[PDB]
Structure formats: structure tokens, C-alpha cells
Amino acid sequence: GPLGSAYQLLLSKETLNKILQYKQNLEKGLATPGKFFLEELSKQEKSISEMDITTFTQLLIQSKKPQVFAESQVYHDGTDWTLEEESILGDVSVNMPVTMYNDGGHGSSFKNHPKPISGYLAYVPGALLASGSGPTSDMKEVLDNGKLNQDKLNALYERRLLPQLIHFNELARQNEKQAAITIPGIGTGCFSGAYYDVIKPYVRNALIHILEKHKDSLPYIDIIHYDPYMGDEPAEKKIGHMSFRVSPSGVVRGTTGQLDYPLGSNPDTHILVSIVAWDHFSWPGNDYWGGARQTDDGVKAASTDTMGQVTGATGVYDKKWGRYMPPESFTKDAKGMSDWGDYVRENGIVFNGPVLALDKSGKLDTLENVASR
Ligand SMILES: Nc1ncnc2c1ncn2[C@@H]1O[C@H](COP(=O)(O)OP(=O)(O)OC[C@H]2O[C@H](O)[C@H](O)[C@@H]2O)[C@@H](O)[C@H]1O
Ligand code: NA
């Protein structure tokens, strides 16, 4: 079979149901794919009905582009993606082991790790409440006549984050360690739209609700370091056995960065995981495919070997600028037209890896297996 993939795509049981309904609607001629999904379908040979659910899902995920800003560059009307596709893509997360080269500070605030540290990233798209065009799938889902609904937002983040929490619980267990997870203010910046001034407490409440509800499934998760940067009160509380900390590093001096061990954890006792505020439509690291070390997604990708994990190439970390650069051979000359998205174009890289679903018993399994049982 294929070579091992450094990255793994996960999704919830409810997202699998949406995928099955979509696949069946296409098979019956009730749905039209978006043009980008159609483009990826046309590069393989199978009809929708002949391909299986995992291949079908992979091809939809493959329609993502290296850099695309959901808040401003998407129409939601089939000329790019449809709302039915967007509902699915927003639920898909991706994890990968990484080397972390700095603590994740934005701009020039980053602090280099003397020795690069090992851990993991889990890219998860936030609730998309911004658009340069019409309303989004997430807006339809979590707003009632324009008002945010906490219970509906809770269910959305539950769908999106629980598969990764379950994954890293099991990974901590099999590594005979506990998990420390750093989390940013997902959805509270570029994705917040008109809700910028009110969204922050909703996200913190959603995280607390998911951890309270599922604590029995997360015995190897130990520390949750939630850093909304600004706009939430510093706090520490116990959620069952788990230490949940609200540590906004934009207002409090001397907080640990997203790509660093929170207080109480170290490499011998914990695996280190950071959630990344991702994008429905882009590859992990979005902005930084275009050379921009900007936003949680672009900063964390640039500050790790994310792009090496996705492309398979060996990049070179630049200490002065806090960013993992393309291979020296690619950068040497090239007219400076040599960022990672340029690398993708000339080497025909695609984003496509293994995908698993979280079944109703709390086990990650193949789409085929979950759908049948
Ligand atoms: N200087 C800073 N240092 C640290 N955190 C900061 C800083 N400035 C803002 N934050 C916090 O960073 C947190 C994350 O805000 P965002 O990165 O916009 O994420 P989203 O989920 O809303 O938008 C996702 C889109 O943005 C990307 O392009 C993706 O690819 C998507 O296209 C917030 O708490 C900020 O307050
Ligand atoms: Na609740």
C-alpha cells in the first residue's frame, strides 16, 4: 500500500452521517458537487457509487487549497464549494507529530527553543461566523435569528474537538504518559465577524462543557492550557481530574507559549499537543503557504515542521525569522518566488491522507466500519 502518512484526518460520527447523506444525494442525482470537489473527482477514474466512503471523503478533503481564507475568499455557492461541502469540511480535523522550533509567539515575540522540542498539532476549524459573501453553514447552525446559541455552539465544538481529544488520550496511554494540551481562542479572531466583541466567553464555555461532559473518556488528559490571548479572565479550575487554565498571554506577563510545556508538565511525564485554529478550505498552515507567518494557523505551521510533514520535503528552520523555510535547493535563486505554496505547485503535492471517524462507543475506526455498525 501507500507509504505511511505523517498526518491523520479525523471526524465525528455526526460528520460521517453528513458525508453518507451527501454521497447518497450525489448518487441519486439530488446534489451537484462544487466545482473544486468536481475537479478532484475528475483526476481519478471511479464514479461516486463505485468509490467507497473513505475515498469519497479523502477526495473532498483534497479539494482544499494550500492557502485560502474562509473569512473573505469563498462564495459558498458551488462555484467553489457548496454549503453541504462546507458543513463537512469544517468538521474535519488533522493531527501530526511535529518538531517545535519556538514557543509560538506571533510577530517577533517568539522565543526560540534552545533544543527544538517534540509534540503534536491538531488542526481544527473554528465556527465560521465571517464571510465576504453570503451566510455560512456555521452561521446557519449556531445563530438563531442572528443571536449566538451556546448549546448549538457547544455541539459544534464537541463534534470537531472530541475526536482529537480521544485520539490523544489513547496516544498518551500507549506512550505511558499524560497529555498536556494548549488551546488558542479558536474562532475568536478572523472567523468571528460581527461577533468579535461577544464570542470569547462562548468558546471558553464550549471547551468547559466538552471537558465536563466527556471527562470519563479522557483519563490520560491532565492539563488544558487555554490561551485566548486577550479578553478572558485568568483562572484555574479542576474539571474532574483535569487542570483547566485560562491564561491569556497578551495581558499576563510570563505565560508559557502554545508551543511549550505548560507549568506542571515536562517531556518525561507528558506528551505536548497544541490545537490549531484551522480553515474549512485550506491545508494546515494556510497563511504560511503564501509565506506569511500570521494567525494561529500560519504561526504554528511556520514554527514547526508542519510543512515538511505535509510535503515530505526537509525544510530548514530560520532562527532569525522564526520560520521553517523550504529546502535550500528550492530557495537558492528562484527569484524569491520560493515559498511553500510555490513548492507545492512545482512538485504537484496534494493534501490527502488516512481518515478515521469517532464511533458512538468512543473508538476511532474506519469510515467503512463506523458506517456499518
Ligand atoms: N499577537 C497575537 N499573539 C497571540 N495570539 C493572538 C495574537 N493576535 C490574535 N491572537 C489570538 O489568536 C486566536 C486565534 O485567532 P485567529 O488566528 O484569527 O483564528 P480564527 O479561528 O478566528 O480564524 C481562523 C482563520 O484564520 C487563519 O487564517 C486560519 O487559517 C483561518 O483562515 C484568537 O484568540 C486571537 O485573539
Ligand atoms: Na453545559
Author numbering: 37 to 409
Study authors write:
ADP-ribosylation is a reversible post-translational modification involved in various cellular activities. Removal of ADP-ribosylation requires (ADP-ribosyl)hydrolases, with macrodomain enzymes being a major family in this category. Further analyses reveal DUF4804 as a class of MavL-like macrodomain enzymes whose representative members show unique selectivity for mono-ADP-ribosylated arginine residue in synthetic substrates.
Thus, it appears that the arginine insertion contributes to packing interactions outcompeting ADPR binding. Mutation of R370 to alanine, while retaining normal (ADP-ribosyl)hydrolase activity, led to successful capture of ADPR-bound MavL, with well-defined electron density guiding unambiguous placement of the ligand. H142 and Y265 interact with the adenosine via π-π stacking, yet a commonly present aspartate in other macrodomains stabilizing the N6 atom of adenosine is absent in MavL. Furthermore, the proximal ribose is held by interactions with the backbone of G221 and P264 and the side chains of T224 and K236. The di-phosphate mainly interacts with the backbone atoms of the loop containing residues from G223 to F227 (referred to here as the di-phosphate binding loop, loop 1): specifically, the α-phosphate with C226 and D332 and the β-phosphate with G223, G225, and F227. Another loop from D315 to D323 (referred to here as the catalytic loop, loop 2) is responsible for the distal ribose binding in MavL, with D315, N322, and D323 directly forming hydrogen bonds with hydroxyl groups on the C3”, C2” and C3”, and C1” atoms, respectively. In addition, D333 forms hydrogen bonds to the hydroxyl group on the C2” atom. On the other hand, the substrate-associated w4 is bound to the phosphate groups of the ADPR and further stabilized by the backbone of A313 and D333, and the side chain of T331. This water is the closest to C1” atom (with a distance of 3.3 Å); accordingly, we propose it to be the catalytic water and its possible activation by the α-phosphate of ADPR for nucleophilic attack at the C1” center following an SN2 mechanism.
